[model samples]
Target: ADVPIIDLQQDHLLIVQQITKACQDFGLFQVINHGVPEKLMVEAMEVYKEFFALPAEEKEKFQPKGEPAKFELPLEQKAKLYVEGERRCYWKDTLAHGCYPLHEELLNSWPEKPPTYRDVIAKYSVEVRKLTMRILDYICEGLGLKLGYFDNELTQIQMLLANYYPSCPDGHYDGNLITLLQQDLVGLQQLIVKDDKWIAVEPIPTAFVVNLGLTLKVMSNEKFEGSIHRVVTHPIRNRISIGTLIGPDYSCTIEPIKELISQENPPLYKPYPYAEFAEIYLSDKSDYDAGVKPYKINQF
Candidate 1:
């Protein structure tokens, strides 16, 4: 979808109103001059390229704890569940991880060859998370919730997925929110249900691609939508996208916020606990697979 492009510095109180509508209407948007340093974006890309390009064996050393990371030579990994009734293999390699508990340089599997790898990425993480908080505030006000509500509730577990798609295709919400940093590539897409279509979100060299999630939609009874989207592989170019997902801790309860409910409107979703995910899974209805279906309340 040709989602709205929001210039963080150009809007003000009026921007808040714009954000509310964008979330309710598009669920996908972008921000420019959102405060993350341009230099860091370059460094982050350098680090990713260097790390993924490492010798096969060297890459092995950076695997899952006590194990190796998922490294597919060329085209091996496939989102079997993602493709409705069919397993479509993708040309890509991925390094997935959770960014919390605390970041330890040496013990952590961060790339050492780049020297500044950990430092740069960690800094980028901080900056982006900060941006996420600010946006959450705007979203909170937009949804008419107390300001900082999301900031207080959803900032605990931040997950990161660094993906490299080689001459192929690619692939959020259930948790709270997802911010995608598109580095030197773009194959990301967002579903525009209102339009019954999927729109390719072209990478804006200087912005972060932000998407709303299930929790937000549930909390607002569809006032906000965590749109459905998937990445389509390119025939000849490689794409790298780092997705940072914001979520609540395991113990946090998830339900429709009372503030969003009233006499004229009832809750559209039932309450549940937040885990690795809530109804937002690899499978969805209509070939897309689904999670929200599990929690949708019957209209009758």
Candidate 2:
């Protein structure tokens, strides 16, 4: 299946229709002319490449204040949840930091070795945030909800992660509402379609690959599902991708939109607090379904 590539320069209604169709059918798509500048995107990727290129000891200086210089979790433990019925550690390096609500506080923890790191990422994030809000507005409109419907629910977080994969294994759904990803020229991104087959979503320069998350799946009353995707690493060509994750406030109560449900199609999930749901997700060592199963409303 060809993953839809949406041109944001098109008519508003046309883009909305395209987005809605993609969301329903594949739960993922790529966007071009989405308002984030190409130059900044390049700079953001460059800074991270520089950061990761630094000596391992230098990178350790950026670890959070309370945590040990090294994270104790073993690779096998982390990769066990990702692969299908297998235990294999992926070869990758990840650097993640909060970008919104606490940027000032968290900025200190971000890599400062590149010197230009903070400045470039801050500007890149601001642009991406604008793009995210606009795309989400289009998503709400497509779902028959008024524009800005998620404004209140979405203001809490915008966590950014830069993942460098030298070679690897992976798969899973996102835990947030949506994740906007920008990747290098490498062809490592893939998603499942018919017959559990995987299809490559080749990189389009400066374009973002957007995938809905579990939060939106519940909010849309299952009209859109969190897409299941995986990244396969290459031996000769390294892969670098950045993800800007948007999620609801933990305090918010998540439930199906009343407008999307009817007596004939009652709420499929019981109301649950986003924090409680996330806690369950964090508590489980594996199994994506573990966090969601308890909230399911069994009809029988």
Winning model by lDDT: 2
Model 1, 1-300: lDDT tens per residue? 358888788767766887777887887888888888988877877787787677867765554444543322221121110112223553556665556544463226555566776788778777778888888888887877788787655567676667777673323343455455554555677777767776778777778888877666777777777756676666677777777777676667777888878876788878876652443453334333255566668577
Number of colliding residue pairs in model 2: 0
**Superposed model 1: Cα runs more than 4 Å off:** 65-90, 101-107, 168-176, 276-289, 298-300
Looking at candidate 2, the ten consecutive residues that score lowest on lDDT are 75-84
TM-score, model 2 to reference? 0.87
Model 2 Cα lDDT, one tens digit per residue, 107-127: 776667789987998899889
Give candidate 2 regions above 4 Å deviation. Answer: 64-90, 168-170, 187-190, 283-287, 298-300
lDDT of each: 0.66, 0.75
